[PDB]
Structure formats: structure tokens, C-alpha cells
Amino acid sequence: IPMDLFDFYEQMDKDEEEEEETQTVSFEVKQEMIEELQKRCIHLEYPLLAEYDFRNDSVNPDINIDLKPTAVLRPYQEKSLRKMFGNGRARSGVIVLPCGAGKSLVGVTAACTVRKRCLVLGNSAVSVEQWKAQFKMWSTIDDSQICRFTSDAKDKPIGCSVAISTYSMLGHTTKRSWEAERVMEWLKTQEWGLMILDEVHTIPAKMFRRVLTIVQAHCKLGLTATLVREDDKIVDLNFLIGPKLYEANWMELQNNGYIAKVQCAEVWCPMSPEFYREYVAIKTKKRILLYTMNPNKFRACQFLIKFHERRNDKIIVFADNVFALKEYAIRLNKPYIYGPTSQGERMQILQNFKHNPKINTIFISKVGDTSFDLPEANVLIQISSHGGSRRQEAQRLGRVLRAKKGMVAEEYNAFFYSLVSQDTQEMAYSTKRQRFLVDQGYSFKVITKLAGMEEEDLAFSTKEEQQQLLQKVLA
Amino acid sequence: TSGTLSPLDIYPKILDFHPVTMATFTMTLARVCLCPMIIGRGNDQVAISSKFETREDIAVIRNYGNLLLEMSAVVPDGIVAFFTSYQYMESTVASWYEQGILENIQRNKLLFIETQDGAETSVALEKYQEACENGRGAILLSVARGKVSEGI
Amino acid sequence: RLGMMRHLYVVVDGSRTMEDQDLKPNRLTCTLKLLEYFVEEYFDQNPISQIGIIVTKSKRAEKLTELSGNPRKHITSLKKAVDMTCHGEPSLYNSLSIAMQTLKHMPGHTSREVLIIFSSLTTCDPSNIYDLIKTLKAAKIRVSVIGLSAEVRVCTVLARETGGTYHVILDESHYKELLTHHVSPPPA
Structure with a gap:
């Protein structure tokens, strides 16, 4: 019976003296006792099923957060917290929802419900500042106990939620990675007990994974929309944070005056003289530029901007590469936003795009992801298949697009487009993209021709024009 | 007697005597009657704490004012809304005569306030x-205490 | 069946409440569609007879078909009405006055009848409706009401006082049973 049972720490492992012989592990591996990774503590179901239990004799009895107030979440989010009360730590650990519908609120509520000494992990200071703005109803004495805790200073019991910090490892002041042995954990190194991760996909990377791996970490919750990069690490995240409690939030459940119905499309474009000579012959990182700048595909992108500007729709055009961004945008004479565009000029372009009926198309680089209050529109065109994550295409779509007036309860009232050059490595991404969007509940189709592109003025009207671009791209 | 009294106890409690008991009518099926309760329908429907129901504006505005309007507009029949006091009644229905500009029902209903008059009561019936x-x-x-309890 | 001749004024509720989806597609669509089925069955049972069609909508009365003995006008009018739908609130007093004016003209041995399909709760008319009900019973104009989920007392008295036919309809099957009862002739 476990009334005497010791349990202790060595470098990244838990060893269990004079044992109760617990299920699901090897025995006398190198001594009479059981020995697991720290990170295996998460498997509380394997003892719970057996009817086994354990005690935290290493406890520290100091004080904790109360945060008694409540707020109102979206109908699935409320169902998702209600499930978490239901399931408990044996059968909980991540939630997936867009970066534009209430993820900050799920984190402050997840900490106010769970109610333990908490450390909040985030990607960015702006997101700490959005959390703070969310959290003001549960903030103790409004503004006299909230503080930041990162590379310049630390103070107070709370802040953006409870104490927030960043994932970073540049040196001894880049907080969570550097501090990962001092505080956290109620069961050993026992100052705190609860972990809330915003942007949770960020942690299972090869160096970062160690922050999570080198503890027992009692309660853990993660929140994300991108969930994984193109190589799919996600089997690891079940171990590292916990299993996935939720994924859906389909626009099928929020149509009539609520968000958008999006017609999704992929566009297959043919390939014009000289560009495949050179695509086929070049194996280097330049070849990405011949399939993105393919003038038949540029003419589809131009024709599509013209159709939706003729109807006065608002359009964001995404370009994965600053070269591509500027070659498309300067030719189409639409503003662009990227890293080196300043805050003053970005806020002028974005205010113009949202409120000026003359400024209806803009071009944007990778800087929108991971926190660029991207503006509202009704049309999204991606010039390329990229290598950022099929799941980030759906986060980006979801956070940017809304219903056009009048038509707020129809089958579709917003539009997404991804442009693909036929007979290239750009095509490989489609059978995955298509399967992921339809599994996310989206109506998605393939457009393979445009015989009305043969009825109007567009660029690259000759071989000589196309040759002028081909020489510039090759250089 | 009082029509119903089946749980029996309160009358012997009030009397400090133990009458002979008897049920002396044949009753009809439960299905001709329906006796609902209302409180909310999603987990975000938190405005009904009623720690100070006489002061909770958000609670009066939410399902107390809003459910009445949903139920009355959907179920279009002749329906009387009973209140615990005049002050609640006045706050819940903005009416033609409002206690404030900030009150939360807009629909054709009739009032039954103090100085009721026997002739004026009949006009409304x-x-x-x-x-x-x-x-x-x-x-x-x-108000449930008031004269409408005599009925017609 | 032959023995006498009937005059019947079909009156339909074209108020905003008739748009509702409670009775197939919506009440307006289900009622006009079954009412077309009734006209052909009533005229087949009653070869020497007449009908006229009135609606109450947008707080007024409008004549969809004039009083006549050819069924074709009435099914063509029920077809033409569905497109223009329903909005607003009844005008029952003005509809019983135009119906009265046509019915008063008719001779001694023919019936005087008004058939009303009712999905409202009152009517917008200022005029005193009780004076007009007294006048219907003197004139021998009989008024029947088929109501949707509704027992509001002035309509029910109005159908009882004029002859005894206030009926409630809760399905498309029940409405076809009610119209088919009205297809049935009077004694002679």
C-alpha cells in the first residue's frame, strides 16, 4: 500500500524505491525498483484504470490565486471548458482554435478555473499585452499587482494572466528555457504547478522540447491554430503537453449573420515558353521563383484581382517571399506590407485598406502570422503553395476573411484562392491541402481553365515581355 | 380545503391539531397540464446570480426581460406575466410609460398598477x-399578490 | 349532387403570420395549394354553384377573384397569389362588408356562405364588428373559420353567431379534412 512510498529525481528520470509494482512499465531494469522519464508522469490513466493512486509528500503549503469572476465565451468554447472539467489531467492537455476568435480568453479562463500557481508561456510581448487587456476583469486591484516577467525585469504575484514569460534561449535572460529548473512543478522542484502555453506548436522543436521534457509538470494546457509545420511533429505533442481535447469550430456552425461561408479554390495554371527549360534545368532555391512568377499564373492573379475590385471586394494577397511580394505588388501598383515597412506606414496602409473605398487590394509577407492584427477582407489569394504549413493557410484564412454585406447568410460570401503552376513540385502540396480543408469542413474545388482570360487586357502579352522577366529572374 | 393540499403537513403544523384527512374528488390525467421552469440554455448565460435581484440590472435585461420577449413573441397566445413587485414589473417592461429610458422589453402588453378601480379592471379583462x-x-x-388573483 | 345552388366567399389571411414555416414550406404555400384542391372538389360535388375570393393583407381587403361559376378562375387566382405572398395584419370587417354586398343580392333558395382561413389574433378595422355580425345573421350569411393554432374570442363568436363552424387545424392532413367537410352540400 503506498502510505510509505518514496519517489525521487535523477538528471531527467524518476526512480521509485520499495515499489507497489505499478502497471504498464519494465521491472528490475537495473535494480529492484521502477524507473521512468519525468515526462511519463502525464500517463495518470494507466494507474487510474488499474485503480492505483499516489501522494505528494514533497508539497509546499503557501498561498494561491482565486480569480472568482467569470465571463462568457463562444458556444463551442464554453462546451470545451465544460469538457475539461469532465475529462481531468488523465485525459486532457491541448485545445485547437483560430488566432482571431477568443484564444486569449480561453487561457485566462483555463487558469481562473484550474486555479493553481501558474506560469504562462507566450511567443511575443504584443500577445502578452493583448492577454493583459483580456485579463482586466480578473486582475487583483486593477493595475497594482499586474507585472511583466521577462529579459529586462520581474515583479508581483500576477500579470498577463499569472506570471508570463517567453520560450526564448539566446542567453541567461531569455526566460522559460533558462529558468526551467528553478521554480515550476508542485511534485518536485515544487514552487508552482500549472503550465499554460499559448501558440503551443512552438515548443516540440528539437532544442525547445527539452523545456517540457526536463520536469514531471503536473497540469499542462496548450492553445493553438497552426498546430504543426509541414513535417508534422504532432505525435510528440500528446506526450509533451497532453492529448487533444478539442478541434473543430467549423464555419458550418456559424453562418446566418455570424462569420462567413468561404468558397475555397485551388487554381491550376499552365506554364508558358522558356520558364520550364529553366525550371527543369535548375535544382537550386531560385526554381521556387520560376513557378511563382510564371506569367500565365500572374495573369490568373491579375484577372482575379480585377474581377473582385470590379465588385468592390476587399482583397489581401499573400506572398511568401519579399522578392516575389515586390515583383507582383509593384507591377499591380497595390501597397505592400512586410518587415522593413515601418509601423507608421503600415497603420496608414491598413487604415486606408479598412476605411477607404479606393484602397481594396494589399500584398503581405510572412509577418502576418504569429501576431499581426491582420485586417478584415472578403478575398484571400496565395501566389504559391509555400512551405509554412497547410494548417497555417487555414488559421490565416479564418482570421482574415468575413461575409460581404447583404449576403451574410448565403452558401458563400467570401473567397480563398491558391495558385499552382502545372508540371512543377508546387503541385505536390495539393492532395494534402485538399484533404485537410475538407476534413476542416470547408467547400473546396479545383479550377483548371479561365477562357475569359482570353477576352481582356492583362500582362505578358508577348514572348518578348515574358523574356524580359525570364532574364531578370534567372540572374 | 384549498383545492390541492396533498403533502398535508402545513395545515396540522398551523393548527397544532390533527384533523381527519380525506381526498374527495376523482382527478384527470397530468397531460392536460404542463408546469415549466426557465433559467438559461448555454454555459455563457451567467446573468441570474440573484445575490441582489432587486439591483442586478444585467440580470433583469438578460433572460428575465429577453426570455419573456422570446416566449411571448413565439407563443402568440393570451398570456399574463406575474411579478414579485411593481418595481420589477416597471423595470422589466419599458411599456409606453417607462421608469427609465434604459429598460428592455418592446412589445404591446397592458399594465395592472395600483389604484386599480373595479370598473377599470373589467375594461382590461x-x-x-x-x-x-x-x-x-x-x-x-x-404583481401576483394583486387583484388579478380574483380572476374572471 | 344536385338540389340547390351555393354562393361561397373564400377569405384568406395574408398577414405576416401566414409566412411562418410551421405548416409546410410556410402557411401561405400549404393553404393556397390545398385551397386549389378544395375548389375543384367543391365545384365537382356542387356543379351549379358560385365562389368569390378575397384576401386580408397589409391592414386591407383585396379581391383575388370575382363571384362566378367557372372553377378555373379560382384555381388561376390561387396560383397567381402565391408569388405576391403575405405581410402585415388582417382587415376582416371590410372583407365581411364586400362579401355581404355580393351575398345580399342572391335569391331566396341559394345558400349565403363565407369560408375564412385565419392565422392572426385580432383585426385592424376600427368599425364595430358586433353590428356587422348581427346584420350577417339577419341577411342569412353564414361564416365559418378554420384557425391555425388559435381560439381568440371575437372570431369564434363571430363564426357561432352566424351559424356554428369555428374549427382548429394543426396539420396539412387536418386542413385537407376540414376543407373536404366544407365541400359537402347543405339540405334542400
């Missing part, structure tokens, strides 16, 4: 029996 939602016993507000 003539209106409710004749037609429309509104009248006395119809889409009208009355």
Missing part, C-alpha cells in the same frame, strides 16, 4: 377576452 395578446389575464403584467 374585456380586452383580453375579446382579441389580441393584451388585456387583464392576456399579455399584461400584474
Whole structure:
């Protein structure tokens, strides 16, 4: 019976003296006792099923957060917290929802419900500042106990939620990675007990994974929309944070005056003289530029901007590469936003795009992801298949697009487009993209021709024009 | 007697005597009657704490004012809304005569306030029996203690 | 069946409440569609007869078909009405006055009848409706009401006082049963 049972720490492992012989592990591996990774503590179901239990004799009895107030979440989010009360730590650990519908609120509520000494992990200071703005109803004495805790200073019991910090490892002041042995954990190194991760996909990377791996970490919750990069690490995240409690939030459940119905499309474009000579012959990182700048595909992108500007729709055009961004945008004479565009000029372009009926198309680089209050529109065109994550295409779509007036309860009232050059490595991404969007509940189709592109003025009207671009791209 | 009294105990409690008991009518099936309760329908429906129901504006505005309007507009029949006091009744229905500009029901109902008059009471019951939602016993507000309890 | 001749004024509720989806597609669509089925069955049972069609909508009365003995006008009018739908609130007093004016003209041995399909709760008319009900019973104009989920007392008295036919309809099957009862002739 476990009334005497010791349990202790060595470098990244838990060893269990004079044992109760617990299920699901090897025995006398190198001594009479059981020995697991720290990170295996998460498997509380394997003892719970057996009817086994354990005690935290290493406890520290100091004080904790109360945060008694409540707020109102979206109908699935409320169902998702209600499930978490239901399931408990044996059968909980991540939630997936867009970066534009209430993820900050799920984190402050997840900490106010769970109610333990908490450390909040985030990607960015702006997101700490959005959390703070969310959290003001549960903030103790409004503004006299909230503080930041990162590379310049630390103070107070709370802040953006409870104490927030960043994932970073540049040196001894880049907080969570550097501090990962001092505080956290109620069961050993026992100052705190609860972990809330915003942007949770960020942690299972090869160096970062160690922050999570080198503890027992009692309660853990993660929140994300991108969930994984193109190589799919996600089997690891079940171990590292916990299993996935939720994924859906389909626009099928929020149509009539609520968000958008999006017609999704992929566009297959043919390939014009000289560009495949050179695509086929070049194996280097330049070849990405011949399939993105393919003038038949540029003419589809131009024709599509013209159709939706003729109807006065608002359009964001995404370009994965600053070269591509500027070659498309300067030719189409639409503003662009990227890293080196300043805050003053970005806020002028974005205010113009949202409120000026003359400024209806803009071009944007990778800087929108991971926190660029991207503006509202009704049309999204991606010039390329990229290598950022099929799941980030759906986060980006979801956070940017809304219903056009009048038509707020129809089958579709917003539009997404991804442009693909036929007979290239750009095509490989489609059978995955298509399967992921339809599994996310989206109506998605393939457009393979445009015989009305043969009825109007567009660029690259000759071989000589196309040759002028081909020489510039090759250089 | 009092019509119903089946749990029996309160009368012997009040008397400090133990009468002979008897149930002395044949009753009809439960299905002709329906006795609902209302409190909310999603997990975000938190405005009904009623720690100070006489002061909780958000609670009066939310399902107390809003559920009444949903139920009355959907179920279009002659329906009387009973209240615990005049002050609640006045706050819940903005009416033609509002206690504030900030009150949360907009729909044709009739009032039943103090200085009721025996002749004036009948006018409101003539209106409710004749037609429309509104009248006395119809889409009208009355405090439960008040005269409407005599009925017609 | 032959023995006498009937005059019947079909009156339909074209108020905003008739748009509702409670009775197939919506009440307006289900009622006009079954009412077309009734006209052909009533005229087949009653070869020497007449009908006229009135609606109450947007707080007025409008004549969809004039009083006549050819069924074709009435099914063509029920077809033409569905497109223009329903909005607003009844005008029952003005509809019983135009119907009265046509019915008063008719001779001694023919019936006087008004058939009303009712999905409202009152009517917008200022005029005293009780004076007009007294006048219907003197004139021998009989008024029947088929109501949707509704028992509002002035309509029910009005159908009882004029002859005894206030009926409630809760399905498309029940409405076809009610119209088919009205297809049935009077004694002679």
C-alpha cells in the first residue's frame, strides 16, 4: 500500500524505491525498483484504470490565486471548458482554435478555473499585452499587482494572466528555457504547478522540447491554430503537453449573420515558353521563383484581382517571399506590407485598406502570422503553395476573411484562392491541402481553365515581355 | 380545503391539531397540464446570480426581460406575466410609460398598477377576452399578490 | 349532387403570420395549394354553384377573384397569389362588408356562405364588428373559420353567431379534412 512510498529525481528520470509494482512499465531494469522519464508522469490513466493512486509528500503549503469572476465565451468554447472539467489531467492537455476568435480568453479562463500557481508561456510581448487587456476583469486591484516577467525585469504575484514569460534561449535572460529548473512543478522542484502555453506548436522543436521534457509538470494546457509545420511533429505533442481535447469550430456552425461561408479554390495554371527549360534545368532555391512568377499564373492573379475590385471586394494577397511580394505588388501598383515597412506606414496602409473605398487590394509577407492584427477582407489569394504549413493557410484564412454585406447568410460570401503552376513540385502540396480543408469542413474545388482570360487586357502579352522577366529572374 | 393540499403537513403544523384527512374528488390525467421552469440554455448565460435581484440590472435585461420577449413573441397566445413587485414589473417592461429610458422589453402588453378601480379592471379583462395578446389575464403584467388573483 | 345552388366567399389571411414555416414550406404555400384542391372538389360535388375570393393583407381587403361559376378562375387566382405572398395584419370587417354586398343580392333558395382561413389574433378595422355580425345573421350569411393554432374570442363568436363552424387545424392532413367537410352540400 503506498502510505510509505518514496519517489525521487535523477538528471531527467524518476526512480521509485520499495515499489507497489505499478502497471504498464519494465521491472528490475537495473535494480529492484521502477524507473521512468519525468515526462511519463502525464500517463495518470494507466494507474487510474488499474485503480492505483499516489501522494505528494514533497508539497509546499503557501498561498494561491482565486480569480472568482467569470465571463462568457463562444458556444463551442464554453462546451470545451465544460469538457475539461469532465475529462481531468488523465485525459486532457491541448485545445485547437483560430488566432482571431477568443484564444486569449480561453487561457485566462483555463487558469481562473484550474486555479493553481501558474506560469504562462507566450511567443511575443504584443500577445502578452493583448492577454493583459483580456485579463482586466480578473486582475487583483486593477493595475497594482499586474507585472511583466521577462529579459529586462520581474515583479508581483500576477500579470498577463499569472506570471508570463517567453520560450526564448539566446542567453541567461531569455526566460522559460533558462529558468526551467528553478521554480515550476508542485511534485518536485515544487514552487508552482500549472503550465499554460499559448501558440503551443512552438515548443516540440528539437532544442525547445527539452523545456517540457526536463520536469514531471503536473497540469499542462496548450492553445493553438497552426498546430504543426509541414513535417508534422504532432505525435510528440500528446506526450509533451497532453492529448487533444478539442478541434473543430467549423464555419458550418456559424453562418446566418455570424462569420462567413468561404468558397475555397485551388487554381491550376499552365506554364508558358522558356520558364520550364529553366525550371527543369535548375535544382537550386531560385526554381521556387520560376513557378511563382510564371506569367500565365500572374495573369490568373491579375484577372482575379480585377474581377473582385470590379465588385468592390476587399482583397489581401499573400506572398511568401519579399522578392516575389515586390515583383507582383509593384507591377499591380497595390501597397505592400512586410518587415522593413515601418509601423507608421503600415497603420496608414491598413487604415486606408479598412476605411477607404479606393484602397481594396494589399500584398503581405510572412509577418502576418504569429501576431499581426491582420485586417478584415472578403478575398484571400496565395501566389504559391509555400512551405509554412497547410494548417497555417487555414488559421490565416479564418482570421482574415468575413461575409460581404447583404449576403451574410448565403452558401458563400467570401473567397480563398491558391495558385499552382502545372508540371512543377508546387503541385505536390495539393492532395494534402485538399484533404485537410475538407476534413476542416470547408467547400473546396479545383479550377483548371479561365477562357475569359482570353477576352481582356492583362500582362505578358508577348514572348518578348515574358523574356524580359525570364532574364531578370534567372540572374 | 384549498383545492390541492396533498403533502398535508402545513395545515396540522398551523393548527397544532390533527384533523381527519380525506381526498374527495376523482382527478384527470397530468397531460392536460404542463408546469415549466426557465433559467438559461448555454454555459455563457451567467446573468441570474440573484445575490441582489432587486439591483442586478444585467440580470433583469438578460433572460428575465429577453426570455419573456422570446416566449411571448413565439407563443402568440393570451398570456399574463406575474411579478414579485411593481418595481420589477416597471423595470422589466419599458411599456409606453417607462421608469427609465434604459429598460428592455418592446412589445404591446397592458399594465395592472395600483389604484386599480373595479370598473377599470373589467375594461382590461374585456380586452383580453375579446382579441389580441393584451388585456387583464392576456399579455399584461400584474404583481401576483394583486387583484388579478380574483380572476374572471 | 344536385338540389340547390351555393354562393361561397373564400377569405384568406395574408398577414405576416401566414409566412411562418410551421405548416409546410410556410402557411401561405400549404393553404393556397390545398385551397386549389378544395375548389375543384367543391365545384365537382356542387356543379351549379358560385365562389368569390378575397384576401386580408397589409391592414386591407383585396379581391383575388370575382363571384362566378367557372372553377378555373379560382384555381388561376390561387396560383397567381402565391408569388405576391403575405405581410402585415388582417382587415376582416371590410372583407365581411364586400362579401355581404355580393351575398345580399342572391335569391331566396341559394345558400349565403363565407369560408375564412385565419392565422392572426385580432383585426385592424376600427368599425364595430358586433353590428356587422348581427346584420350577417339577419341577411342569412353564414361564416365559418378554420384557425391555425388559435381560439381568440371575437372570431369564434363571430363564426357561432352566424351559424356554428369555428374549427382548429394543426396539420396539412387536418386542413385537407376540414376543407373536404366544407365541400359537402347543405339540405334542400
